[model samples]
Target: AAQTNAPWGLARISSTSPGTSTYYYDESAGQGSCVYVIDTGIEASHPEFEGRAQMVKTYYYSSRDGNGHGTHCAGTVGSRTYGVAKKTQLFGVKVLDDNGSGQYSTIIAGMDFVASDKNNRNCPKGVVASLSLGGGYSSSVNSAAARLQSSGVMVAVAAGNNNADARNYSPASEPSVCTVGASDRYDRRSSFSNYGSVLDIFGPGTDILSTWIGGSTRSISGTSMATPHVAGLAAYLMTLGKTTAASACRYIADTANKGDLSNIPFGTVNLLAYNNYQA
Candidate 1:
């Protein structure tokens, strides 16, 4: 048999072999907190997503699945091994259909759900809305997202996969949103990821392993995969006591590994503040 270099690799867990079966425990375990996914519907039965998903609510403005892109994006954020936030609860808002098309109104409706729910103590506490999809910078959806920011819901958006300037996309370009760019294992920008001042942080995106619809597995690439990585970080931060959206953003920006930003086109996201701060 020939050796195979897989396009995607699993995260490395510290090795303490020949020990008890429960010896492995990662510090960053998600434990299934609630995270609202404002994208397409997920593959409810995927192995990586099977026992881990709970759709608090779903609204399908389009009622279709154009390219299955939204499902792919959702899987990255909440899928088991493929997910960085495995235990986090998933809330699906199918603003975009299977065909990969949706209107600004649909997206805003999803944000509205998050904002309204945040006001209710009975609902899930400390919810962070993850948006892996977006339109142009000047789109109505961008403005909608900005409005939601004041309501105390954290919005993490994909900084587009166009490789263009951040000025080109909405939501991602919007000041209030936490725009995520893509990076490889070495922490360099993915060639297809957008860059510029609007970018708030970066995450693993190239050749990412995530779930596909109908109990399948595959590797996909884009800023989509990257958005959830940061989303997961935000969820973990909340668990660590950085509960507010502003505080979460501050933690991510000030604590990121910035030692090698020269080669990173969009500059690096500084995460030291959140990484070092207590609560």
Candidate 2:
């Protein structure tokens, strides 16, 4: 039983009502938050952004997005159609290159930019960052994310796709960031998603559709997709006075849809992301 045929991912997050599938939110959701997209650059011109997406900084030759990954992630965070927080201002901070590949130095540089901007008040009062890329553990990368949170920017990172203990990954393992895993429409963990006590939350990631490069949209699945949902939700919380990194992260993990998922590997957190809206 469901109402208002919205995207399944959006619908599920607001599903406190019995037999409900509608996606509900306040009209001003994310209205004052600025989100940092820290990955392959976003195509700021994507129509779905309605001119809200803009490039702030880049470690690459330019902010021109060659890989569609960053654009898709940004869309899930703030696009008018697919976003979890529709009114957010998206700031592209390119670290990864055309192939969605980046070194530890590049990623750290991007994080520093965000932290510095936050510290200097170059960004809005409410700030958040989304990272959808990572491999194994890296002490340096983890430190950068930690420092960013200390600077007051909420960070959400993707648990690796390896399906192993997420604690073994870099930013995912970083205690200072919100590490996100993937779940499907059936409320089950996606097979490719890593799991562990390190994971802070899960989001609908399977076959999720969002804006892409070349003025189009595409469906894809990964912990990458899930991370942005958490990022968007964290941004929404920021607008509601959860401005500090620790506060936003705590509220998200605490107010999530608890123990509602299946196929969770033992030792993993069963918290699924909710936008603090019950429809």
Candidate 3:
């Protein structure tokens, strides 16, 4: 079952001040939707998931996460306490190896696998591809994401973590994908977050606590962490009957709170402020 109360990130995104409200959304917590995390992988046995997450594909040695990155991202996307959508189906696609490194070709292959839906998870309502890895630009990755978008899949990616313009990065610069940057608990951009005109929105990332690989929980930081927030949000919105990727993005952007950013360069970036659902 999905969580009835809002998580911290969801509360902030939904326009309720964090820790100040017991607000919860009556809508489905991403039921009937699926989110694919393309990264190291996931520990499917994690208790927070309660068997909701699974390793659906792998482009490397094994689908199980050894680096813990994928598991963390998955938790933020759908776990009961840390997730944006507590009931969303979660799948892990292992592109990066245990060392947290992989070739662009492998990542592209992961994207292709996700677009193909080889696992037959039966997400008839909608699907979201959450990418937390980025490096040099890859036209192939962009093309795959475009194809997925054409197929009605929402793609959300990290805006990189180098503290530079995200346009210089691969999937982040891909215009078809929703590029996400990291923000702190105070709703300001994380110092390490990459930003620029390419960024689609900002989400809570710094010191985020979520399920880990060892049946425990831990805190991590990066735009990588922020990407799943939007991914889960996309899934949640899809459950509310926003079927198209473009429409989901539009609803998220339109409902976002503006004028929250104070930094000058980031101020003019026109990014969406993460909020929760009112309905």
Candidate 4:
């Protein structure tokens, strides 16, 4: 029982061993997709990434992951050992500073940069923006996210960890973004996960292990941990020719495992699950 490859979060969603999930079987592991992680920053040299991540911008501080939050989220999004879309190209956009606090303006600027075609470098399949940070509602960030969606990028956002209404948070509350909430191993909602109609999906977030800064790995918790799982799934779908954000979201919602979260409020919002496409 070495349990060598799949991270628990990946296992729960795909129901397959790591590196052997159906996503890999169907789409070649996100070969043509790109995921933009907007957070503190990625370590860039982390071995898990195998040098595939590109640093697109540093809005607030150095793009070196001083706080390790960005690296962890990036790992879950595309690391060889811990990710959902293991081969998806990752891009780092540093908006949060070392303290993990960022102004809404800076975050919006990061979104603008990623949404631009010049910054995207012509990803033929599709692009996804994964945001693991959040604060009170901000109209500017919401509007920016809307623009990104219109430009054909899927935006995945955290629903906040305050255990309140997710609609009270900015990017998460933004109807155009795929807002994710946290669930534990047994598919119960994490106590700190914000819920309500705004939550589009649930993913394993508690005690989740992923790559950290300085070439290490660690376990952490939050709706932040849940967001990337959905982001990675979205990227995988894109590689399968589900190019539009709306189509990808529809496939995800239609095929999710609704029974796992039956007891959780609004659990029907969708629980991350993957399978070969049904015609």
lDDT of 3 by residue, 33-147 (tens): 8899898999989988988999888876667799999999999999978887888999888999998899988888788888788346688668898999989887887787777
Alpha-carbon runs more than 4 Å astray in model 2: 1-4, 17-20, 119-125
Q: Best candidate per TM-score, number?
A: 2
Q: CA lDDT of each candidate?
A: 0.64, 0.85, 0.79, 0.80
- Candidate that would win on lDDT: 2
Estimated TM-score for each candidate: 0.80, 0.94, 0.91, 0.90
lDDT of 1 by residue, 1-279 (tens): 111232232231111111111212235445535567777666555577766654444566443334556667667666665655555666666776666667877778888777786665332335677888877756677778887777776788898988888877888888777888886654457788888888887666877766676677678888887887777667656654545666676667766655443255524443211133221
Segments in model 1 whose C-alpha atoms lie over 4 Å from true places:
1-28, 56-67, 118-125, 266-279
lDDT of 2 by residue, 62-118 (tens): 889998999999999999888888889899988998998988988988899888876
RMSD of 3: 2.4
Rate residue 175 of model 1 by lDDT.
Answer: 79
Per-residue lDDT of model 4, residues 174-261, tens digit only: 9877888898776678889888897788877888989998899999999999889988888888887764666676677777776566
Indicate whether candidate 3 or candidate 4 has the larger TM-score: 3
lDDT of 1 at 134: 76
